[PDB]
Amino acid sequence: SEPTYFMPPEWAPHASTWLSWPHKLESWPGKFEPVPAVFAELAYQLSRSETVNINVLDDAMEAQARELLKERDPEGKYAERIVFHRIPTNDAWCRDHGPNYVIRTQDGRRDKVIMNWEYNAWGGKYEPYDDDNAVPERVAKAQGLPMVSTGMVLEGGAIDVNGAGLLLTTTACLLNPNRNPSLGKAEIEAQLRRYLGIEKVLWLGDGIAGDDTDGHVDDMARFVNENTVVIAVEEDPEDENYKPLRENYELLKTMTGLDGKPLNIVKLPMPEPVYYDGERLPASYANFYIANTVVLVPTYRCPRDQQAIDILQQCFPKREVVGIDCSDLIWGLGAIHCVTHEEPAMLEHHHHH
Ligand SMILES: [Cl-]
Ligand code: NA
């Protein structure tokens, strides 16, 4: 009758990782030049682990990307793994406008589909965003996958799942009137249950400073395994993020899984304050990306970088935790997790796996 869906956790096996090559000068006003190189570094690291699908506007852009990638991979050892797609984009925030892959189950059959949510540039802060909003459909077309549309605004960076029924989010973002004016909390949860197949929504509070997404959870807390959440915690009582992070840490310490058992909470440091043009930037180690063989963590040229990497290495002992300097990328108000979106690999023979 009615199908059910399943959203694999970020640590589940990937078929690939998607990226939207940067080109919007307005995203990094006055300092765009360093950005392309960061994406090349990211694409290179990802190509060591799995296929990398990159959205570009035209052949000229693809050439520019290939040149920068050649500096990272002079011999093209992993060149075959980087596949370009002529898919228009307005911004590079693939995490938020990108393909939200889910596994659909209906009448005993399972298939991979793209769950298309609406995108409105974090509450209408940027424009235009029609191409970003169309990315999921063009990806589905390119891969020949079915697409289901929800009609509700939702960014991938605003949610985080444990792959077993739990979904972590923030009231600051999902309940902000600038996203879904006509919807209330009950309706929003109903849609998350319906289209993502989750069972329990865990609502955290406010996000971090300098954040233009109105509190994305992916700049603060993330599931690392079925019952463990890593959360950034500021130790400087005078820092603006001290209070918000403290409230959410204490809240997490009272949250439980479906079994009613307390979730394991791992503390992560916050980067030392990052500024540009006299403005606080939303730098956070929680904005890391889990790939098949590596975990890519944004770093901000400070002694806390190695601390965050070591903690994440403990959380993912089977992977190589690698840092990528995001000192310039963060001027775009997002980092590694924000510019990526995994494509989970669905095994066709369910009885075998
Ligand atoms: Cl691991
Ligand atoms: Na969309």
SSE diagram, text form:
Blueprint: E1 4-6, E2 14-20, H1 35-49, E3 51-56, H2 59-72, E4 82-86, H3 94-97, E5 100-106, E6 109-118, H4 121-124, H5 130-143, E7 147-153, E8 159-161, E9 166-170, H6 171-174, H7 185-196, E10 200-204, E11 221-225, E12 228-232, H8 242-252, E13 264-268, E14 275-276, E15 279-280, E16 289-290, E17 294-299, H9 304-315, E18 320-325, E19 341-344
Parallel strand pairs: 2-3, 3-4, 6-7, 9-10, 12-13, 17-18
Antiparallel strand pairs: 1-5, 2-19, 5-6, 8-9, 11-12, 14-15, 16-17
Sodium ion (NA) binds near residues 117, 119 and 133.
Task: Please give a handful of descriptors for the protein shown.
353 residues; alpha/beta; L-arginine/glycine Amidinotransferase, Chain A; four-stranded mixed β-sheet; 9 helices; globular; binds chloride ion; binds sodium ion; structural genomics; alpha-beta protein; nesg; Protein Structure Initiative
Tell me what you see in this structure:
The longest helix has 15 residues, at 35-49. The protein has 353 residues and is an alpha/beta fold. It has nine helices and 19 strands. The chain is globular and about 50 Å long. Chloride ion binds next to loops. It is classed as structural genomics. Keywords: nesg, Structural Genomics, Protein Structure Initiative, PSI, Northeast Structural Genomics Consortium. The assembly is monomeric.
